[PDB]
Ligand binder design. Structure first.
Ligand SMILES: [K+]
Ligand SMILES: [K+]
Ligand SMILES: [K+]
Ligand SMILES: [K+]
Ligand SMILES: [K+]
Ligand SMILES: [K+]
Ligand SMILES: [K+]
Ligand SMILES: [K+]
Ligand SMILES: [K+]
Ligand SMILES: [K+]
Ligand SMILES: [K+]
Ligand SMILES: [K+]
Ligand SMILES: [K+]
Ligand SMILES: [K+]
Ligand SMILES: [K+]
Ligand SMILES: [K+]
Ligand SMILES: [Mg+2]
Ligand SMILES: [Mg+2]
Ligand SMILES: [Mg+2]
Ligand SMILES: [Mg+2]
Ligand SMILES: [Mg+2]
Ligand SMILES: [Mg+2]
Ligand SMILES: [Mg+2]
Ligand SMILES: [Mg+2]
Ligand SMILES: [Mg+2]
Ligand SMILES: [Mg+2]
Ligand SMILES: [Mg+2]
Ligand SMILES: [Mg+2]
Ligand SMILES: [Mg+2]
Ligand SMILES: [Mg+2]
Lengths: 134, 87, 81, 200, 80
RNA sequence: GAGAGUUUGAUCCUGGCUCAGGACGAACGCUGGCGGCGUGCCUAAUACAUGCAAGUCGAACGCUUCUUAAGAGGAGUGGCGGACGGGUGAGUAACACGUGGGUAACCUACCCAUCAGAGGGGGAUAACACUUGGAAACAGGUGCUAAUACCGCAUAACAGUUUAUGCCGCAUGGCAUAAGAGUGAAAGGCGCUGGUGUCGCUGAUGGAUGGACCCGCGGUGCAUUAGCUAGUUGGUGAGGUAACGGCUCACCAAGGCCACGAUGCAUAGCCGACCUGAGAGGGUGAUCGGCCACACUGGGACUGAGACACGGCCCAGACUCCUACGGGAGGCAGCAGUAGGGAAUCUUCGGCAAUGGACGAAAGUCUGACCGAGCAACGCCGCGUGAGUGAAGAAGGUUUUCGGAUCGUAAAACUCUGUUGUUAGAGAAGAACAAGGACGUUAGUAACUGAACGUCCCCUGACGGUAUCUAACCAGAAAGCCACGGCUAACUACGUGCCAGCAGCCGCGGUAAUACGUAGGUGGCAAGCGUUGUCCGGAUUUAUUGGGCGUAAAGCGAGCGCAGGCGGUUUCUUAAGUCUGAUGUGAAAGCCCCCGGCUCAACCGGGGAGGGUCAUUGGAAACU
């Protein structure tokens, strides 16, 4: 564009959007609205727990939970590690992170936090999966 | 009224002071009108750096040194100069 | 008030308001009497003019009005006279 | 944090002798681990640059954070080649000065001496191995410490002192007459690779 | 004595008595691209006798507030 | 000024996506030795138990209770303070803020300096005593009492104003002189000897300080928001204010703003600064400092130099609490702390010793400011978790091509060190002081006390027996986390069999997996490590620096054209742009440069530089 063209209509950049939107919004019980708060994690209650089929390339029974977060937004989160103790009405903590295999999972359930028990027999990468040092 | 007083500086347990002309109502470390010297009590002979001419001018304008600053100005002899200037 | 000095100031400020309102109303009545005399074309206008100026200055004393307000009123009264 | 693990394993991983004796490399000059003895694929350019960076920091027994800050200071120096200046500062580090003077056989030993405070700079105790030693500052052993077998043995054993260091045996006092020259420093290490590494 | 800002401009409204509207017509560099762009500031100046007409080049000096929007006083009329 | 992976059978180009860096008031997972310095409700401007955060003055005044007439209290009146300091940022898109000007349209207690005055009288009321009502909160009645409380009268016009001169400015006008009309004030206390010192009191002026108003320019999004305005725009008067002003009001007009974005909607405290970047820029607006705004919500004024007042008053409302049902009390966004929300943020601690602030003549009293200490690896910095010698290399683990390789000089063993740790001892600076005791010099006096200044003695530490130093003993109590298919430094065994599972992208897993789990090794870093969240970079991926539009996304179907953008040669001139100098300013702190202090560093201190599309002013005239 000419300089006059840019002056008349300046450059405008694309606006990015979060890969983990549910973590970006808080809730104000009094006003009953959603706030704009960036949170590294968020507490939610497991409304449902089960397993899901991956996308076409892969085959498994990926373990997941449908969770209503503390800001009333309902999302689907993955459950990493081998074996878990979660059930519906179990209080969990959620972190960002997609799952390539699964269609609509954008969050991970942190292990070792709140009602999520560490992974039994985990011995390498213990920080992740939330297991104490044996 | 206008004050000549010590603004504290330095670190915890290691104070330093700047002799500054400031309005009495202002916070100690807050707004001040001008810096006129420094004062380091941690030296065995307490070390003082002073703009004697500026301090005398402010005293003539009616600044009121705090107690410690008055001792400092006396030790530097500024107070006697101010007394003679009044004469 | 939760502070003893606050309670003390409540009483004293109330009393000062009583006194100040009384004196200010007195000054206004003096000015009002002179203005009405000017309107009516009375004979004691000059005596009332002196009284109005006297009242305004005495009101400036005691700090019921600012000195600038007092001078503005004096000029206004002088123009009326 | 201070590294304490085996010394030979680190030296042979780097492929050069940290102590300079070559004793570590002489026998089994393989990278540590079970795959070391057998042939290994060539290293990428990033690996080469990383290896040079590791060479310097393992030589002087420093952590990455302190190493990184020191490199930045070297950059601030205006005159002379950047990598050369960085190596000069590495030398001026207090531990290395003790090592060069030969009051300790190894840099670990010199560091422990400084940490325990047996050394004094200009007659003043200094327990900071990281301490920066200027040209002309006199590094000496604490008077109480002078009669300990370790430092005395190290002095008698060390027979070659770099030109830039000046040392007195009886007083056990040394100092850098001048900043070390590039060739006086370790030549096997290539400072340009380290410079480019931190350029990232 | 300190000086008040005086501006040159062109009258654009005289339908109000004892006052005129002037336009300064400056240019400013665009912050990003730096081209000079025409910028128009207009002032309401008090006219003592409605001398100045529309489309007249006049000078105005800043003054104390004379009305809600007046802040300037007419000085000269250089072109009609 | 570093790139890399991924479209294909393969290739080049285009293009998006993803990664390698840094940062944080972070949180979470595992782990966890210490010290220095700093930081710690980002969410509910949600509600708040409890304790404290604003008092002081007896040398303004009159009372009242005790100690053998003392000192110590107790409540009055009166003075100053309470408008500072501390908290939060809700609101606010606005001269709120930033920067630079203007005010001849301004005010200012306490502090300095100058010139004057400081005379005469008077009536009160608290307190007190009784006494009415009330459940309480608290209101009343009667009778006394003082003041530096209150009111008159006297004198003061230098204030303001008019006039007349002289000078000057930027229109209104400013300054000085003279004259003139009308009126305006005050308080005494302590102490020397009627005089007098000192602190007070009154008027005028000037200074400093603080505040106030106006103005140029600068910094959010949305036009799938285009009309807005009726005291609105201006005038004439009048009133009001510290002051200009539609600030308000009566008349007179119909004007004012707006595509150079009005208005409306949404979001937001602004800045110095901070993070990133090669830079241009992008993001942020914690801690620290400046300004602004707010104090349960809404409104109002009173006192005052100063408030429309966080810990003041009045009214209304929501909520909490007390009632004897008549009526009352309250406001943590002060310091701690509690509940609640949340992923998530601390002790209901010590002291006024230092610096600062209020009152006092001063001792001193008050100060949750502020000094410290406490808790959190939350961050940065610093030091350890030993050092030296030590085998063709012990056992065991792992792995074997069964020979052997690797963990590995690592261990063991021997010789040394105590940073730390434990134990004992010794031990700061931070303290200047004020008052008080002595003298001495100035000015003033007749003389003194006394004032200002000067020199000695005396006097005080919460931190705290804290830092630190010395000496004895012991390798003894003190290393984890993640990663190892490529990007990417780091590889083999089992177990598993498109399962269990991994994953940032490519993608791994279907019985021989360096990609899953475990193991052994190895790499990275280290009292941290990693994950998530968010910002910048890489991203030339909005390209001003720095991209494109024949076929990859992209030339309107074409023209006529208002505004706008741009514009042929040349003489002279101008100096808006442009270049350049000087001056002023762009606070302090923080970056950056020198120089110092902490054993180093972090940190702290000193001196510089920088930082503006800045204002004033002087130059140049090529280009616009
Ligand atoms: K009082
Ligand atoms: K592919
Ligand atoms: K690509
Ligand atoms: K006050
Ligand atoms: K401005
Ligand atoms: K008007
Ligand atoms: K705000
Ligand atoms: K309000
Ligand atoms: K208050
Ligand atoms: K104090
Ligand atoms: K108190
Ligand atoms: K003191
Ligand atoms: K991998
Ligand atoms: K371009
Ligand atoms: K075409
Ligand atoms: K020009
Ligand atoms: Mg893994
Ligand atoms: Mg001292
Ligand atoms: Mg560290
Ligand atoms: Mg808050
Ligand atoms: Mg807000
Ligand atoms: Mg009085
Ligand atoms: Mg860039
Ligand atoms: Mg409060
Ligand atoms: Mg010790
Ligand atoms: Mg590799
Ligand atoms: Mg694996
Ligand atoms: Mg870019
Ligand atoms: Mg096509
Ligand atoms: Mg096409």
């Amino acid at each position: 564009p000419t300089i006059n063209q840019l002056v008349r209509k300046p450059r405008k950049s694309k606006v990015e959007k979060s890969d983990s939107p549910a973590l970006n919004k808080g809730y104000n019980s009094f006003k009953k609205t959603q706030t704009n708060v960036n949170s590294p994690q968020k507490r939610g209650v497991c409304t449902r727990v089960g397993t899901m089929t991956p996308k076409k390339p892969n085959s498994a029974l990926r373990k997941y939970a449908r969770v209503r977060l503390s800001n009333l937004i309902e999302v689907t989160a993955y459950i990493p590690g081998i074996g878990h103790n979660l059930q519906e009405h179990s209080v969990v903590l959620l972190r960002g992170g997609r799952v390539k295999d699964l269609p609509g999972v954008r969050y991970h359930i942190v292990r070792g936090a709140l009602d999520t028990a560490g992974v039994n027999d985990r011995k390498q990468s213990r920080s992740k999966y939330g297991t104490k040092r044996p | 009224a206008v004050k000549i007083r010590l603004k504290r500086m330095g670190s915890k347990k290691s104070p330093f002071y700047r002799i500054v002309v400031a309005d009495s109502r202002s916070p100690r470390d807050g707004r001040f009108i001008e810096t006129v010297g420094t004062y380091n009590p941690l030296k065995d002979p307490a070390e003082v750096v002073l703009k004697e001419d500026l301090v005398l001018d402010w005293l003539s304008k009616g600044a009121q040194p705090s107690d410690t600053v008055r001792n400092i100005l006396s030790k530097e002899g500024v107070m006697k100069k101010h007394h003679e200037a009044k004469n | 008030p939760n502070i003893e000095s606050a309670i003390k100031r409540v009483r004293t400020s109330a009393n000062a308001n009583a006194k100040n309102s009384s004196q200010t109303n007195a000054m206004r009545t003096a000015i009002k009497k002179f203005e009405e005399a000017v309107a009516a074309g009375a004979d004691n206008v000059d005596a009332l003019y002196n009284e109005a100026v006297k009242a305004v200055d005495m009101a400036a004393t005691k700090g019921l009005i600012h000195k600038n307000k007092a001078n503005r009123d004096k000029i206004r009264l002088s123009k009326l006279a | 944090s201070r590294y304490t693990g085996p010394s030979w394993k680190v030296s042979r991983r780097l492929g050069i002798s940290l102590s300079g004796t070559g004793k570590e490399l002489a026998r089994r000059p393989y990278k540590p681990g079970q795959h070391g003895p057998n042939s290994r694929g060539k290293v990428s350019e990033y690996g080469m640059q990383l290896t040079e960076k590791q060479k310097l920091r393992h030589m002087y027994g420093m952590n990455e954070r302190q190493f990184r800050t020191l490199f930045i200071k070297a950059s601030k120096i205006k005159e002379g080649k950047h990598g050369v200046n960085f190596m000069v500062l590495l030398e001026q580090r207090l531990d290395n000065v003790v090592y060069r003077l030969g009051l300790a056989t190894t840099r670990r030993q010199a560091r422990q001496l400084v940490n325990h405070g047996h050394i004094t700079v200009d007659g003043k105790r200094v327990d900071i191995p990281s301490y920066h030693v200027e040209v002309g500052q006199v590094i000496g052993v604490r008077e109480k410490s002078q009669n300990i077998s370790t430092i005395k043995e190290a002095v008698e054993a060390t027979v070659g002192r770099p030109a830039f260091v000046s040392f007195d045996t009886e007083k056990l006092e040394g100092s850098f007459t001048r900043l070390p020259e590039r060739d006086e420093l370790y030549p096997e290490i290539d400072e340009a690779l380290v410079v480019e590494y931190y350029n990232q | 004595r300190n000086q008040r800002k005086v501006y040159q401009g062109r009258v654009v409204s005289d339908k109000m008595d004892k006052t005129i509207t002037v336009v300064v017509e400056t240019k400013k560099n665009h912050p990003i691209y730096g081209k000079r762009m025409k910028y128009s500031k207009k002032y309401k100046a008090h006219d003592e006798n409605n001398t100045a007409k529309v489309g007249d080049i006049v000078k105005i000096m800043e003054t104390r507030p004379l009305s809600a929007t007046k802040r300037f006083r007419l000085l000269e009329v250089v072109e009609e």
